[PDB]
Amino acid sequence: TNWSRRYKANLEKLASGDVNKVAEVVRDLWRRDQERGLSAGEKRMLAKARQILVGELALAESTDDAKAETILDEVLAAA
């Protein structure tokens, strides 16, 4: 039930959408993989956490690029 509490806690972190919490899941499972080794299920969750994490990074980059693009357009237009 310790394992289950932990598993559910991580699910809720992943469901949160909060990239900092997702980051915790990745770090915890990765460390656990190095130290104890992960079960098949934990490997799956680690793979998902990583996917969510990479997706958030790609989103944030796309967002910065879109903003920078609109700003540069306004500068060129004003000139």
Curated annotation (Swiss-Prot):
UniProt entry keywords in alphabetical sequence: Virulence
Function according to Swiss-Prot or TrEMBL: Controls rRNA transcription by binding to the RNA polymerase (RNAP). Required for replication and persistence during infection of mice.
High-level lineage: Bacteria, Bacillati, Actinomycetota, Actinomycetes, Mycobacteriales
Full-sequence portion shown in this chain: 83 to 161 of 162
Keyword check for Amino-acid biosynthesis: no
Ligase recorded as keyword: no
Biological processes, Gene Ontology terms: rRNA transcription
Family listed: Belongs to the CarD family.
Protein's recorded name: RNA polymerase-binding transcription factor CarD
Source organism of the structure: Mycobacterium tuberculosis (strain CDC 1551 / Oshkosh)
